[PDB]
Write a protein that binds this ligand. Structure first.
Ligand code: PLP
Ligand code: PLP
Ligand code: MN
Ligand code: MN
Lengths: 322, 322
């Protein structure tokens, strides 16, 4: 009944960011329709400013602060970091981004290109959170969490406002899940406007905390730091997004590393959209064996292609020839 | 005054193919605007059916035949071959595609995937033309030339009808040139509707026959088979497209291999559009030193991103890390 955001927060966020973001297109694919037997629609957040949907939450959070702040601080595998740095730069606010050592080089470099101070941490939720806390204290900055901050969650939710308008007959949204900010914002939004529309999460089997949490009915974070090509969804879900996910998300589909790699390459080759592997997670979910159990009434499915920030040099390892 | 096609042919082609092709989007890039000091618009033919704009000419040609034909035949580095095979398959007509031995593997495989009989030839204009002639005779098929066939040229020209509608304030179109079918169709169209709009060709320095022809005022085909990463524009311009290009194209910009590689990678990384290197030729042209000499009045420039059929495995060689 009462969560850390409401639909009204999402509506407000949309008005406050729409002049500063792209109304990204919804594209289709005949081959992917044929492979799934569904009518698919691809929400192209890879074309968003900074290369992912994270600009939505970042702009909303920075503008929700509006003496100006001394600094903004966060932890990020890269996309929220880039987005926050860009949003903060527009207001003349310096940014400190705490980033795991094992984040992709392209993401590390982009954060530095936008002028942030990058601070490497160890690759775990605990290290990300603890180092961001220390950096926040040292800089006397403002922490803008990548997925648990209400202003961030409300910003990500605005994706659903656009999808429901662009695909008026949509039956389901499929959303990749890491910390659950996007999934939670979208769930709040869809279930407020047209709750008959399904909200499905897609998650790596190698980082399956959201799936485990829903199964067990309690928050079950990753016990070991995840090893996955879906580098942007290694975070566990958190205390603010869990209750929304528990109550408002219809199902969660897990996908293996091989499935993620295959779906990502299929989008590259067939749609010509350079999605990052994390964005391939949603595509893998709809292609998966378990998704065939979804009712045939759920025909019009919109998959969020959440980002396009991929290391081309690092992607030469897993790319397979036909 | 009188060329092998007219504007009326392009208009007719558009009505005859529009129900069967995508009205591809026009996208923008802030970074590419910043780099060029121009206002750029990208016509996304990479999203077209079969991965390039060639579906336009192919559908128009196949439907311009409408006992049904025994077979269709062509020569192609891959894109026209794929498009022709698809168009012919819709009508239950078999296809024989003559393809140079050194065409990219992805293109060879796609032609076979669409059900064509592929016939390898030696990598030269002479071999392509001679083998297609022999195959046409042996199969008693109909030759559909990739760039000199009027129905094909008229089909490619329809790109300009869309661009002029989608970018109403456009000042110039930039078009990659191989055989000159697209360039000629676009030139006929633009100069009929709003001749103040510039039509610029973009060409590899390593395959610079169009540039040489315009300089010398006569058709000067490539003396040696071109060596270029822009694998789809190795053909010389021909007898039907040359007069149109001579008279109606405003300038031709050549770009080196390094420029093509750099522009292609920039589009991948910054726009998240998986263009093939041939489609990077137009982007390289607007980024080139010589394009800076174009009048500052030519502000709104639409570049045709002509195709997305790229060998990912073969592209691991030239991709450079930042
Ligand atoms: C952040 C991100 C996600 C996951 O969003 P959460 O709010 O962390 O669940 C998915 N894809 C991409 C590209 C992202 O950057
Ligand atoms: C065919 C083609 C061109 C060139 O068109 P021509 O009519 O041969 O000049 C450019 N880019 C791509 C991707 C093509 O397939
Ligand atoms: Mn997870
Ligand atoms: Mn040439």
């Amino acid at each position: 009944a009462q969560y850390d955001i409401s639909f009204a927060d999402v509506e407000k966020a949309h008005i406050n960011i729409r002049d500063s973001i792209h109304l990204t297109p919804v594209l289709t694919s005949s081959i992917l329709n044929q492979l799934t037997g569904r009518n698919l629609f691809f929400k192209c957040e890879l074309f968003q400013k900074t290369g992912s949907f994270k600009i939505r939450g970042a702009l909303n959070a920075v503008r929700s602060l509006v003496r100006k702040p001394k600094a903004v601080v966060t932890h990020s595998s890269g996309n929220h970091g880039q987005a926050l740095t860009y949003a903060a730069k527009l207001e003349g606010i310096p940014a400190y981004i705490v980033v795991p050592q094992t984040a992709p080089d392209c993401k590390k470099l982009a954060i530095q290109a936008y002028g942030a101070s990058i601070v490497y941490c160890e690759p775990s939720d605990e290290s990300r959170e603890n180092v961001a806390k220390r950096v926040t204290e040292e800089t006397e900055g403002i922490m803008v969490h990548p997925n648990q901050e209400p202003a961030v969650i409300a910003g990500q939710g605005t994706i659903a406002l656009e999808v429901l308008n662009q695909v008026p007959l949509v039956d389901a949204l499929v959303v990749p899940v890491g910390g659950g900010g996007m999934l939670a914002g979208i769930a709040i939004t869809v279930k407020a406007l047209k709750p008959s529309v399904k909200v499905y999460a897609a998650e790596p089997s190698n980082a399956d905390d959201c799936y485990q949490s829903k199964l067990k009915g309690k928050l079950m974070p990753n016990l070991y730091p995840p090893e996955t090509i879906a580098d942007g969804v290694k975070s566990s879900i958190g205390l603010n997004t869990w209750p929304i996910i528990r109550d408002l998300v219809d199902d969660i589909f897990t996908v293996t590393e091989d499935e993620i790699k295959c779906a990502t390459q299929l989008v590259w080759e067939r749609m010509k959209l350079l999605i990052e592997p994390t964005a391939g997670v949603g595509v893998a979910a709809v292609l998966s064996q378990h998704f065939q159990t979804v009712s045939p009434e759920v025909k019009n499915i919109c998959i969020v292609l959440s980002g396009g920030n991929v290391d081309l040099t690092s992607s030469i390892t897993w790319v397979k020839q036909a």
